[PDB]
Design an enzyme around this catalytic site. Structure first.
Site, PDB file in Angstrom:
ATOM      1  N   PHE A  71      86.154 101.436  85.075  1.00  0.00           N
ATOM      2  CA  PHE A  71      86.723 101.901  86.209  1.00  0.00           C
ATOM      3  C   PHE A  71      86.132 103.311  86.331  1.00  0.00           C
ATOM      4  O   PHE A  71      85.758 103.607  87.348  1.00  0.00           O
ATOM      5  CB  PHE A  71      88.412 101.889  86.061  1.00  0.00           C
ATOM      6  CG  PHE A  71      88.970 102.725  86.816  1.00  0.00           C
ATOM      7  CD1 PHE A  71      89.220 102.304  88.254  1.00  0.00           C
ATOM      8  CD2 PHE A  71      89.225 104.080  86.581  1.00  0.00           C
ATOM      9  CE1 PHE A  71      89.743 103.206  89.291  1.00  0.00           C
ATOM     10  CE2 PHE A  71      90.021 104.886  87.741  1.00  0.00           C
ATOM     11  CZ  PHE A  71      90.174 104.314  89.081  1.00  0.00           C
ATOM     12  N   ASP A  83      93.108 101.502  92.767  1.00  0.00           N
ATOM     13  CA  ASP A  83      93.594 100.252  92.114  1.00  0.00           C
ATOM     14  C   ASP A  83      92.689  99.715  91.380  1.00  0.00           C
ATOM     15  O   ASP A  83      91.501  99.473  91.980  1.00  0.00           O
ATOM     16  CB  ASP A  83      94.511  99.524  93.087  1.00  0.00           C
ATOM     17  CG  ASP A  83      95.652 100.384  93.638  1.00  0.00           C
ATOM     18  OD1 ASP A  83      96.246 101.059  93.005  1.00  0.00           O
ATOM     19  OD2 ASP A  83      95.866 100.245  94.765  1.00  0.00           O
ATOM     20  N   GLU A  84      93.300  98.926  90.427  1.00  0.00           N
ATOM     21  CA  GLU A  84      92.426  98.340  89.481  1.00  0.00           C
ATOM     22  C   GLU A  84      93.118  96.921  89.289  1.00  0.00           C
ATOM     23  O   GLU A  84      94.031  96.399  89.909  1.00  0.00           O
ATOM     24  CB  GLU A  84      92.299  98.892  88.056  1.00  0.00           C
ATOM     25  CG  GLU A  84      91.777 100.309  88.119  1.00  0.00           C
ATOM     26  CD  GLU A  84      91.997 101.152  86.862  1.00  0.00           C
ATOM     27  OE1 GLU A  84      91.383 100.411  85.893  1.00  0.00           O
ATOM     28  OE2 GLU A  84      92.481 102.184  86.957  1.00  0.00           O
ATOM     29  N   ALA A  85      92.298  95.990  88.351  1.00  0.00           N
ATOM     30  CA  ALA A  85      93.149  94.983  88.058  1.00  0.00           C
ATOM     31  C   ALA A  85      93.531  95.195  86.445  1.00  0.00           C
ATOM     32  O   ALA A  85      93.101  96.198  85.770  1.00  0.00           O
ATOM     33  CB  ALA A  85      91.733  93.732  87.683  1.00  0.00           C
TER      34      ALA A  85
END
Length: 493
Positions: free
Chosen positions: A310, A300-302
């Site tokens: 990423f 998961d990322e922002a």
């Protein structure tokens, strides 16, 4: 009348009903091979049957008939078994203890619901006659529990393990860090668990596992033939770590602990070298506690996160997993970030996920990346069944019992070769769930379906007949004390 031999979940690979049933009686014994692997499963079985039957059920290595657990050569693999039942006794044969354990889980479904009670009940105790021969379709059959959003104790995790073991799951994915909590003691970074684990969604008291608490979860899981797959989600969903160690933040300031339920705001600082020292340390201590083959590094990322960042994060972090002797697993964002050889990606997309996002995962699959399927509109157990469900979320749509079951992993993701599919997972997120009964209410009755998709042959797949087998579980759930959603799609008796 005994429960018919085929009325089990997962649907067994081959069911051949015939002959008179076995009757468990005061003279029944449990016969095991002369060994430890052997007695352990026998003692587990006795523990299951003695309370409700009231019979002594001694475990021995002699005597005709009774319930025989046999390790032998045959076409069983690591997890499969054969179960023969007739007037003289019940025999479960397998190559390994896991196979015997799986056979035991079938046997309990064949017995009357009353077998699950904790005090003596009237009989009779019939096991339908015939033969089951049973081996799994997929090797990856996993249940996740989020202990970050709300914290669940060691005992509560044990209880969940006992629920998933009923249905022959073989992996337990533990989501042990997120924005609202960090749940494992890391000696090199002690504030993670003590500060970052201090609260949870809603601002209540949190908690964390000591290293001993974690090893106990791992050991109990292994006794139920579940390999523990721990996740440290990164680079996003890291607020608890970021709140604990100011130096992890790109701006050098520790955010407050987060107790809400928004996602996508947090990130590790991909361009600071201390980030990789932190990741190396955490995954090192985690690998030393993890006898299983996998580390799940999340992915998961922002919303902010540039794809370039990423990609760079993952290019640097994935090797760390192999440095500590383990295999990478990541959510399917990892498919756009050059998964290393032998990495698995877990697909959580939905029907409305874009064609391009689907094709990038399919592309990775065609290149040899194995896939774990867990679509958010199919096997997320935190998703509401309908608009009237009081807990859970609805961002991926409503997910009734049929939708959750009625699909084929091998013919699901456009573009992806069937042979890339390793199995399936049913994730239980806990933004909305704070107690074990609530976990059960959202896990049941969909959890057995996903187990069936992981285990059973495609040839057994059929909603109209599956739903009758599922309704047959309810009296068992009632005796076991498992809360569940009485879906109107299922024909409960």
């Amino acid at each position: 009348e005994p429960t018919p031999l085929d009325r089990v979940i997962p649907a067994p690979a081959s069911v051949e009903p015939g002959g008179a049933p076995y009757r468990i009686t005061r003279g029944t014994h449990i016969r095991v091979d002369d060994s430890r692997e052997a007695r352990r499963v026998g003692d587990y079985l006795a523990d299951l049957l003695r309370p409700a039957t009231g019979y002594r059920l001694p475990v021995t290595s002699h005597g005709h008939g009774g319930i025989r657990l046999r390790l032998a050569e045959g076409p069983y693999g690591d997890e499969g078994y054969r179960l023969d039942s007739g007037r003289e006794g019940v025999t479960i044969t397998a190559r390994k203890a896991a196979g015997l354990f799986h056979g035991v889980q079938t046997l309990r479904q064949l017995l009357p619901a009353a077998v699950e009670k904790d005090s003596a009940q009237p009989g009779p105790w019939l096991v339908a006659g015939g033969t089951i021969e049973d081996t799994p379709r997929y090797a990856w059959r996993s249940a996740m529990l989020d202990v970050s959003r709300h914290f669940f104790s060691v005992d509560e995790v044990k209880r969940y393990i006992d629920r998933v073991a009923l249905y022959k799951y073989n992996k337990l994915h533990l989501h042990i860090s997120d924005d609202q909590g960090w749940r494992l003691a890391i000696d090199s970074w002690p504030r993670l668990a003590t500060y970052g684990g201090s609260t949870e969604v809603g601002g209540g008291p949190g908690g964390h596992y000591t290293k001993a608490d974690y090893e106990e979860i791992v050991r109990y899981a292994a006794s139920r033939h579940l390999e523990v797959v721990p996740e440290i989600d990164m680079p996003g969903h890291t607020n608890a770590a970021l709140a604990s160690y100011a130096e992890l933040n790109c701006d050098g300031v520790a955010p407050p602990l987060y107790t809400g339920t928004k996602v996508g705001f947090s990130t590790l600082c991909v361009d600071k070298d201390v980030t990789y020292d932190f990741v190396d340390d955490v995954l090192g201590e985690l690998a030393a506690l993890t006898p299983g083959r996998y580390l799940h590094i999340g992915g998961d990322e922002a919303h902010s996160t540039p794809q370039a960042d990423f990609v760079a994060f993952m290019k640097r972090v994935q090797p760390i997993v192999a440095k500590y002797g383990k295999t990478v697993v990541g959510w399917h964002q990892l498919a756009g970030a050059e998964p290393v050889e032998g990495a698995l990606v877990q697909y959580w997309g939905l029907d409305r996920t874009s064609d391009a996002e689907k094709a990038q995962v399919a592309a990775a699959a065609r290149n040899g990346t194995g896939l774990i399927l867990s679509p958010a509109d199919r096997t997320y157990l935190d998703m509401k069944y309908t608009k009237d469900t009081p807990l859970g979320l609805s961002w991926a749509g409503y997910v009734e019992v049929r939708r959750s079951y009625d699909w084929d992993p091998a013919a699901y993701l456009p573009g992806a070769p069937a042979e890339a599919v390793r199995g399936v997972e049913a994730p239980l997120w806990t933004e909305t769930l704070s107690d074990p009964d609530q976990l059960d209410f959202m896990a049941f009755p969909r959890l057995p379906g996903v187990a069936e998709l992981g285990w059973s042959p495609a040839s057994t797949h059929d909603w109209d007949t599956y739903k009758v087998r599922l309704a047959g579980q309810a009296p068992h759930w009632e005796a076991m004390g498992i809360d569940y959603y009485r879906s109107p799609q299922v024909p409960w008796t």
